[PDB]
Amino acid sequence: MPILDSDILYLYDAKLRMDSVTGRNLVSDVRLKRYLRDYWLDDGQDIWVRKNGTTTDAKSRMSVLLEEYNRTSGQKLSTKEARNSGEFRSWLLDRLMDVRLFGATMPMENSSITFTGPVQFSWGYSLHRVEINWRVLYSLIGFHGIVSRNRARHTGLRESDLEALDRAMLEAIPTEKIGQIPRFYLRLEYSEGYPYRVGDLREDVVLEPVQGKTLDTLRDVRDYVINLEKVADRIAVRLDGLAGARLYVHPDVTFRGLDSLTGVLGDKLQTLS
């Protein structure tokens, strides 16, 4: 199966002179990808962006990889020749799944290889204002991600890599004082050649506090209902291009409009759990 363009909506929560401080919590895409990489590393996989918890010099790691490729392939590529070698580039990609997904900048002595990752994430932000008491009390974080069909052609992305990404979105964060729990994961795949996208759904999510709570005092997953009604509406408009969907929801979340979402997706929906 060819790689299709995708949109991702991902929610997870994190728990446990000025005072009375509040604001919008932010999580870099680099941090999210670090959770995913550490998870695959702990699964024994070969990963490019890895530590020893001391980081490794990238130029040294590339020199080792090039010398290994040269002695196995019977070549003597220089770093400049290695940069231009489609064979060495494909050999690196076959070996490092995180490069196939997220790309990499791989310096060498007086050269460098650059892979632009098909899978890209926004910065994550809290869908509500969080309280600071210097640590955040509670934060429901939302991420938008994409999978680029065109970029996947240049990194050798495999269909099995995307299934591994889906499973890591469920398992990596809990595996890697602050408890962090995935709560919602939706990946929408688009038909080949379809030009439009749902895009970023995070602003269409609506949090509805339970009685006694407000949007400024959310402290636990039980304090609010996640209303998906507008998310279902936004997806329905693009139904003419939707090829498939993957969806996971945590059992402790209370949803409104989850039935609307699954009904829109229909037979395109595959579940994850």
Coordinates of C-alpha atoms in Angstrom, one line a residue:
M1 CA 0.0 0.0 0.0
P2 CA 1.3 3.5 -0.9
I3 CA 1.8 6.1 1.8
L4 CA -1.1 8.5 1.9
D5 CA -1.2 12.0 3.2
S6 CA -2.4 12.2 6.8
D7 CA -3.7 14.6 9.4
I8 CA -3.3 13.8 13.1
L9 CA -5.1 15.1 16.1
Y10 CA -3.5 14.0 19.4
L11 CA -4.5 14.8 23.0
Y12 CA -2.8 13.7 26.2
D13 CA -2.8 15.1 29.7
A14 CA -0.1 15.7 32.3
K15 CA -0.8 16.1 36.0
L16 CA 0.8 16.9 39.3
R17 CA 7.0 38.7 42.2
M18 CA 3.8 36.9 41.2
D19 CA 1.2 34.4 42.4
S20 CA -2.1 33.1 41.0
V21 CA -0.1 32.4 37.8
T22 CA -1.9 30.9 34.8
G23 CA -1.1 30.6 31.1
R24 CA -1.0 28.4 28.0
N25 CA 1.3 25.4 28.4
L26 CA 3.5 24.6 25.4
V27 CA 5.3 21.3 24.4
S28 CA 7.8 21.4 21.5
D29 CA 7.5 18.9 18.7
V30 CA 11.1 17.9 19.5
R31 CA 10.0 16.7 22.9
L32 CA 7.2 14.7 21.6
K33 CA 9.4 13.0 19.0
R34 CA 11.9 12.3 21.8
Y35 CA 9.3 10.3 23.7
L36 CA 8.6 8.3 20.5
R37 CA 12.3 7.7 19.8
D38 CA 13.0 6.6 23.4
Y39 CA 10.1 4.1 23.2
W40 CA 11.5 2.5 20.0
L41 CA 15.0 2.5 21.5
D42 CA 13.7 0.6 24.6
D43 CA 12.1 -1.8 22.1
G44 CA 15.6 -2.6 20.8
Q45 CA 15.3 -0.7 17.6
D46 CA 18.2 1.2 15.9
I47 CA 17.5 4.9 16.3
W48 CA 19.5 7.9 15.0
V49 CA 18.7 10.4 17.8
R50 CA 19.8 8.5 20.8
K51 CA 21.9 9.0 23.9
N52 CA 24.5 6.8 25.6
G53 CA 22.2 9.8 29.5
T54 CA 24.9 11.6 27.6
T55 CA 24.3 12.6 24.0
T56 CA 26.5 11.3 21.2
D57 CA 28.4 13.5 18.7
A58 CA 26.5 13.2 15.4
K59 CA 29.5 13.6 13.2
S60 CA 31.2 10.7 15.0
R61 CA 28.1 8.6 14.7
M62 CA 28.0 9.3 10.9
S63 CA 31.7 8.5 10.5
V64 CA 31.1 5.1 12.1
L65 CA 28.1 4.4 9.9
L66 CA 29.9 5.4 6.7
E67 CA 32.9 3.2 7.5
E68 CA 30.6 0.3 8.2
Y69 CA 28.7 0.8 4.9
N70 CA 32.1 1.0 3.0
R71 CA 33.5 -2.2 4.4
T72 CA 30.2 -4.1 3.9
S73 CA 29.6 -2.8 0.4
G74 CA 33.2 -3.0 -0.8
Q75 CA 33.3 0.7 -1.5
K76 CA 35.5 3.5 -0.3
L77 CA 33.1 6.4 -0.4
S78 CA 34.5 9.7 0.9
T79 CA 32.2 11.9 2.9
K80 CA 31.5 14.0 -0.2
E81 CA 30.8 10.9 -2.3
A82 CA 28.7 9.5 0.5
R83 CA 26.5 12.6 0.5
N84 CA 25.7 12.1 -3.2
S85 CA 25.3 8.3 -2.9
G86 CA 21.7 7.1 -3.3
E87 CA 22.9 3.7 -2.2
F88 CA 24.4 5.0 1.1
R89 CA 21.3 7.2 1.7
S90 CA 19.0 4.2 1.2
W91 CA 21.2 2.0 3.5
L92 CA 20.9 4.6 6.2
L93 CA 17.1 4.9 5.8
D94 CA 16.7 1.1 5.9
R95 CA 18.6 1.0 9.2
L96 CA 17.1 4.0 11.1
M97 CA 13.2 4.0 11.4
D98 CA 13.2 7.4 13.1
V99 CA 14.8 9.0 10.1
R100 CA 12.3 7.4 7.8
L101 CA 9.6 9.0 9.9
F102 CA 11.0 12.3 11.1
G103 CA 14.0 13.0 8.9
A104 CA 17.4 14.0 10.2
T105 CA 20.4 16.3 9.6
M106 CA 23.4 14.0 9.5
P107 CA 26.7 15.9 9.5
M108 CA 30.0 14.4 8.3
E109 CA 33.5 15.8 8.1
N110 CA 33.2 18.6 5.5
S111 CA 29.8 17.3 4.3
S112 CA 26.2 16.6 5.5
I113 CA 23.1 14.5 4.6
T114 CA 19.7 16.0 5.1
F115 CA 16.4 14.0 5.2
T116 CA 13.2 16.0 5.5
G117 CA 10.7 14.0 7.5
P118 CA 7.3 13.1 6.1
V119 CA 5.9 13.1 9.7
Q120 CA 5.8 16.5 11.2
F121 CA 4.2 17.9 14.4
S122 CA 3.2 21.3 15.5
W123 CA 4.1 22.5 18.9
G124 CA 1.6 21.2 21.3
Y125 CA -0.4 23.6 23.6
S126 CA -2.9 23.2 26.4
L127 CA -6.5 23.4 25.2
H128 CA -7.3 25.3 28.4
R129 CA -5.4 27.7 30.6
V130 CA -3.2 25.9 33.1
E131 CA -2.3 26.8 36.7
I132 CA 1.3 27.1 37.9
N133 CA 2.0 26.4 41.6
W134 CA 7.2 26.1 39.5
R135 CA 5.2 23.2 38.0
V136 CA 2.0 22.9 36.1
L137 CA -1.0 21.4 38.0
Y138 CA -2.9 19.9 35.1
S139 CA -2.6 20.3 31.3
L140 CA -4.6 18.7 28.5
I141 CA -2.2 19.1 25.6
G142 CA -3.2 19.0 21.9
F143 CA -0.9 18.3 19.0
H144 CA -1.5 18.6 15.3
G145 CA 0.6 16.4 13.0
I146 CA 0.8 15.6 9.3
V147 CA 2.2 12.8 7.1
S148 CA 3.5 14.0 3.7
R149 CA 3.1 11.6 0.8
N150 CA 5.7 13.5 -1.2
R151 CA 8.3 13.6 1.6
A152 CA 7.8 9.9 2.3
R153 CA 9.1 9.1 -1.2
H154 CA 12.5 10.5 -0.3
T155 CA 12.9 8.8 3.1
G156 CA 11.7 5.3 2.2
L157 CA 8.8 5.5 4.6
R158 CA 7.1 2.1 4.9
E159 CA 3.4 1.4 5.7
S160 CA 4.6 -0.5 8.7
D161 CA 6.4 2.6 9.9
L162 CA 3.1 4.5 10.1
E163 CA 1.5 1.6 12.0
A164 CA 4.4 1.7 14.4
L165 CA 3.8 5.5 14.8
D166 CA 0.2 4.9 15.7
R167 CA 1.1 2.3 18.3
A168 CA 3.8 4.6 19.7
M169 CA 1.3 7.4 20.1
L170 CA -0.6 5.2 22.4
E171 CA 2.3 3.7 24.4
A172 CA 5.4 5.9 24.2
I173 CA 4.4 8.7 26.5
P174 CA 3.2 6.6 29.5
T175 CA 6.3 4.4 29.0
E176 CA 8.7 7.4 28.9
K177 CA 6.1 13.5 39.6
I178 CA 4.2 14.1 36.3
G179 CA 1.9 11.3 35.1
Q180 CA 1.2 11.6 31.3
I181 CA -1.6 9.7 29.6
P182 CA -2.7 9.7 26.0
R183 CA -6.4 10.4 25.8
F184 CA -7.4 10.8 22.1
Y185 CA -5.6 9.9 18.9
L186 CA -7.1 10.3 15.4
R187 CA -5.2 9.9 12.1
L188 CA -7.1 10.8 8.9
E189 CA -5.7 9.4 5.6
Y190 CA -6.6 11.0 2.3
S191 CA -7.1 9.5 -1.1
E192 CA -4.3 9.7 -3.6
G193 CA -4.3 13.0 -5.3
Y194 CA -7.0 14.6 -3.1
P195 CA -5.9 18.3 -2.7
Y196 CA -7.7 19.4 0.5
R197 CA -7.2 18.6 4.2
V198 CA -9.1 18.9 7.4
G199 CA -6.0 20.5 8.9
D200 CA -5.6 21.5 12.5
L201 CA -8.6 20.3 14.6
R202 CA -7.5 21.5 18.0
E203 CA -9.5 24.7 18.0
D204 CA -12.6 22.7 17.1
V205 CA -12.3 20.7 20.3
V206 CA -14.6 22.1 23.1
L207 CA -14.0 21.4 26.7
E208 CA -17.2 21.5 28.9
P209 CA -16.5 21.7 32.6
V210 CA -18.6 19.6 35.0
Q211 CA -20.7 21.3 37.7
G212 CA -18.5 23.0 40.2
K213 CA -15.6 23.4 37.8
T214 CA -14.6 26.1 35.3
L215 CA -12.3 26.2 32.3
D216 CA -9.7 27.9 34.6
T217 CA -9.9 25.2 37.4
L218 CA -9.5 21.9 35.5
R219 CA -7.3 19.6 37.6
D220 CA -8.2 16.1 36.4
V221 CA -9.6 14.2 33.4
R222 CA -12.9 13.8 35.3
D223 CA -13.4 17.6 35.6
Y224 CA -14.6 18.2 32.0
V225 CA -16.3 16.6 29.0
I226 CA -14.6 16.7 25.6
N227 CA -17.1 17.7 23.0
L228 CA -16.2 16.4 19.5
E229 CA -19.3 17.8 17.7
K230 CA -17.5 20.5 15.7
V231 CA -14.6 18.1 15.0
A232 CA -17.1 15.7 13.4
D233 CA -18.5 18.6 11.4
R234 CA -15.1 19.7 10.1
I235 CA -14.2 16.1 9.1
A236 CA -17.6 15.6 7.3
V237 CA -16.9 18.4 4.8
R238 CA -13.8 16.6 3.6
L239 CA -15.4 13.1 3.6
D240 CA -15.1 13.1 -0.2
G241 CA -11.3 12.7 0.1
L242 CA -11.0 10.5 3.2
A243 CA -9.4 7.1 2.5
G244 CA -9.2 5.8 6.1
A245 CA -9.0 6.8 9.7
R246 CA -7.4 5.4 12.9
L247 CA -9.0 6.3 16.2
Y248 CA -8.1 5.7 19.9
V249 CA -9.9 7.0 23.0
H250 CA -9.0 6.5 26.6
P251 CA -11.8 4.9 28.6
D252 CA -11.7 7.4 31.5
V253 CA -12.5 10.4 29.2
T254 CA -16.2 11.5 28.9
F255 CA -17.0 12.5 25.4
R256 CA -19.8 14.3 23.7
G257 CA -20.2 13.7 20.0
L258 CA -17.9 10.7 19.8
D259 CA -20.9 8.9 18.2
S260 CA -21.1 11.7 15.7
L261 CA -17.4 11.3 14.9
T262 CA -17.6 7.5 14.4
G263 CA -20.7 7.9 12.3
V264 CA -19.1 10.4 10.0
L265 CA -16.1 8.1 9.6
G266 CA -18.2 5.0 8.9
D267 CA -16.5 2.1 7.3
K268 CA -13.3 4.1 6.9
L269 CA -12.6 3.8 10.6
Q270 CA -10.1 1.4 12.1
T271 CA -9.9 1.4 15.9
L272 CA -6.8 1.2 18.1
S273 CA -6.7 0.2 21.7

